[PDB]
Every structure is written in structure tokens, then in C-alpha cells.
């Protein structure tokens, strides 16, 4: 098998009013090779088929998709907003991001924590979480690497955001 540079973990958040936002998140599985990634991806529904209010998340190094996590707390995220994009375009964009992560395409791969996709009414978002928000060199190299790799349209916007509530 073809070993990955990092171990990754897939999470699935399902919206449940009775459960806290943190409790909505479910740990599915972990993998460390290319073959084990595809085994998983090929047998799970794409984001196009999961329920509204649900998320997929792929994080490395046993990092939880939460602000409270050490690796995320001082970090931020590149947010991509998608309005009424085709379901096939959405799925293809999600996968494209996954392959950037496990493939470690970014020169500043170490700064990346994981990716998240939100399926919501009227809008769907795909975000890539970074470890340090103060690091503009890393944030921008990753940011530039995206628009070229994702082949993003002019309409779709790519904007960086801190996790921590400060201006």
C-alpha cells in the first residue's frame, strides 16, 4: 500500500436538537494509506446525499474539528461559499480538497489541520482549517494553492477567517 505522510480521521456531524453542538459530531474511522482512503470514500455517501444540517470533516493527527482543540484554537480557516452549485460540482470539489490534504500538495502542509464541509439550505460551505492565524505566509500560500488547485470560479469567493472571536 501507498503510505500517507499523516494519519487522518473522518468525522460526520448530524444535526440533532436534543444533542449539544459538540455531541452532534461522530468519529467514523482513521486511515494512513491511499488505498484505505479510497476504500472509505467509495463506500460512503457523497456530501450531495447527506442530510441538511450535517457535516463531513477530515482532520489529521487526531485533531478534533472543534475550536477547543489546541491545534485549532489559535488558528483560522479558508472559507469557500457555494450558492446553488451543481450537486456533482459540490461532490467533485469536496473530493478535490480531500486529495489536496492527504496528498500534502500544500508547501505549508504542516500548518493545515483539516477540512470541513457544511450542507445547509440555500448555501453550502467548504472550509480548510489552519493551525496558526497569525502566520500570513502559511495562510496565503495555502490560499493561493487553493484557487489554482480547486479551479474556483470567479463567482465563488475564498476568504480567510479566525476561529477566535477577535477583530
Amino acid at each position: 500500500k501507498h503510505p500517507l505522510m499523516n494519519v487522518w480521521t473522518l468525522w460526520y456531524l448530524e444535526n440533532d436538537r436534543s444533542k449539544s453542538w459538540e455531541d452532534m459530531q461522530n468519529e467514523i474511522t482513521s486511515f494512513d494509506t491511499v488505498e484505505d482512503f479510497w476504500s472509505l470514500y467509495n463506500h460512503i455517501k457523497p456530501p450531495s446525499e447527506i442530510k441538511l444540517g450535517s457535516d463531513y470533516s477530515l482532520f489529521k493527527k487526531n485533531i478534533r474539528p472543534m475550536w477547543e482543540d489546541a491545534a485549532n484554537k489559535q488558528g483560522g480557516r479558508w472559507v469557500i461559499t457555494l450558492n446553488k452549485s451543481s450537486k456533482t460540482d459540490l461532490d467533485n470539489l469536496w473530493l478535490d480538497v480531500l486529495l489536496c490534504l492527504i496528498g500534502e500538495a500544500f508547501d505549508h502542509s504542516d500548518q493545515i489541520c483539516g477540512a470541513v464541509i457544511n450542507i445547509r439550505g440555500k448555501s453550502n460551505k467548504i472550509s480548510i482549517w489552519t493551525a496558526d492565524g497569525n502566520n500570513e505566509e502559511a495562510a496565503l500560500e495555502i490560499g493561493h494553492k487553493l484557487r489554482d488547485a480547486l479551479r474556483l470560479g470567479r463567482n465563488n469567493s475564498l476568504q480567510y477567517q479566525l476561529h477566535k472571536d477577535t477583530m
Binding site: 505522510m5 460526520y12 488505498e35 467509495n42 463506500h43 488547485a149
Partner: protein
Amino acid sequence: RYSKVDLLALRYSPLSQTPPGIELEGRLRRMNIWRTGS
């Protein structure tokens, strides 16, 4: 380490077509994220 094409080329390898273990599958089905008729 891996390009987009490198990773894609291995998508339909025999090992990549391997099903999840029965515990993982049981979990995937329970979340209802298991690919239908897979």
C-alpha cells in the same frame, strides 16, 4: 508526496475496492452514510 492524478489512479485498485470491516460498515450504516447498494 502525492499529486491529484497519483491518488486518483489508485482509486479503482483492487485494494482500494476493498470493503470496510464489519464494525466500520455497521457504523457507516447506522449513521446512514453508507453508500446505498454498495
